[PDB]
Ligand binder design. Structure first.
Ligand code: TBE
Length: 357
């Protein structure tokens, strides 16, 4: 009702002004049904406003789709996170890849894979040389270092038993079954009219191509489809497809623990209620991008409902954030065309959701 429109206005409006966000779209999920809000422009020079059909670069929020697609493949019996990486890429005959499993790739625990794939890596033979010549800093399953090269390789290998490409597998197994008809890995030409421009220090920019970009940060979506993406993760039991339903639960399963944070397949969870300063300060890159020791969780804790599930994402000129609480049936999406600091995103999201709790 009006309780939602009040808390969103008194929270996002100061956030937009303090961060000088050119355009923003927010979706609040309350008791299943979503509520949408828009501000600012999708194109500054053309003065095109932000609509419910405006495309935003999700950035690293794409990893949530990759983890769900990975869990879906686990439910189909095509892969196991315990399987060696070499089972799906035999040409990776390097000695350091002994014992590195798909779980180590998916949860950034392979031993120190770099944050980003190098810029010069473009062909599949370039990917091979990059992973063959990579030297780990720690043993498998000991240190967690957030890395696009880690989970990005997991997504490309998880779809090999299906025979489909990563783009086609994400379409026919995740996007289409959830009716995400406006979420694309590659934006079609007829949909570029809704493709908003990102802004990095005034200049309009889009995400540039890169190796394993679709698996790590290359997905774009609208505020309507992202809200439906939260409904699916809030209530996986409402999905008819069995493997996709189980894949969403496997993504929210707890495989590693660092402090009070649990690592899933793309998603990151903390027990609810949460100390807000932990998720706010923990979202800063000095903490989130740093290496941290992990403790295994065997067996992986099934999807705990009383949890705070969240994921930040950013590109050159975009800054997205998603957070939901399955027990309260509460969720929020924050899509902005500016890469403003992560702590401002989690602070505004917790204030909105705790008032609706
Ligand atoms: C997760 O949120 C990843 C974000 N990546 C962004 C960024 O850090 O802004 C990019 C994709 C970094 N990157 C990886 C490979 N090449 N660039 S953006 O800056 O290109």
């Amino acid at each position: 009702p009006q309780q939602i429109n009040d808390i969103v206005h008194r929270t996002i409006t100061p956030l937009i002004e303090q961060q000088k966000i050119p355009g923003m779209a927010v979706a609040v999920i309350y008791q299943g049904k979503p509520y949408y809000f828009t501000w600012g422009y999708a194109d500054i020079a053309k003065k095109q406003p932000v609509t419910q059909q405006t495309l935003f670069e999700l950035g690293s929020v794409s990893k949530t789709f990759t983890g769900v697609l990975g869990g879906d493949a686990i439910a189909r019996g095509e892969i196991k996170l315990s399987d060696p990486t070499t089972k799906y890429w035999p040409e990776l005959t390097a000695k350091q890849w002994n014992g590195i499993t798909l779980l180590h790739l998916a949860t950034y625990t392979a031993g120190g894979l770099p944050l980003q794939v190098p810029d010069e890596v473009k062909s599949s033979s370039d990917l091979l040389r990059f992973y063959q010549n990579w030297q780990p800093a720690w043993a498998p399953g000991t240190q967690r270092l957030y890395a696009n090269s880690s989970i990005g390789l997991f997504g490309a290998l998880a779809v090999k038993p299906s025979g489909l490409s990563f783009e086609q597998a994400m379409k026919t197994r995740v996007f289409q079954p959830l009716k995400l008809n406006h979420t694309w890995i590659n934006v079609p030409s007829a949909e570029e009219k809704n493709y908003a421009w990102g802004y990095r220090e005034g200049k309009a920019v889009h995400v540039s191509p890169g190796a394993l970009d679709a698996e790590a940060y290359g997905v774009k979506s609208t505020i309507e489809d992202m809200a439906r993406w939260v409904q699916s993760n809030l209530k996986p039991l409402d999905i008819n497809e069995k493997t996709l339903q189980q894949g969403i639960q496997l993504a929210q399963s707890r495989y590693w623990q660092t402090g009070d944070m649990y690592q899933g397949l793309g998603w990151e969870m903390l027990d609810w209620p949460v100390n807000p300063d932990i998720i706010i300060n923990g979202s800063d890159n000095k903490i989130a991008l740093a290496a941290r020791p992990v403790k295994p969780i065997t067996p992986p804790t099934p999807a705990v409902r009383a949890s705070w599930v969240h994921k930040t994402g950013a590109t050159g000129g975009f800054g997205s954030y998603v957070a939901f609480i399955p027990e309260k049936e509460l969720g929020i999406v924050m899509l902005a065309n500016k890469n403003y600091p992560n702590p401002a995103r989690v602070a505004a999201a917790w204030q909105i959701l705790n008032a609706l709790q």
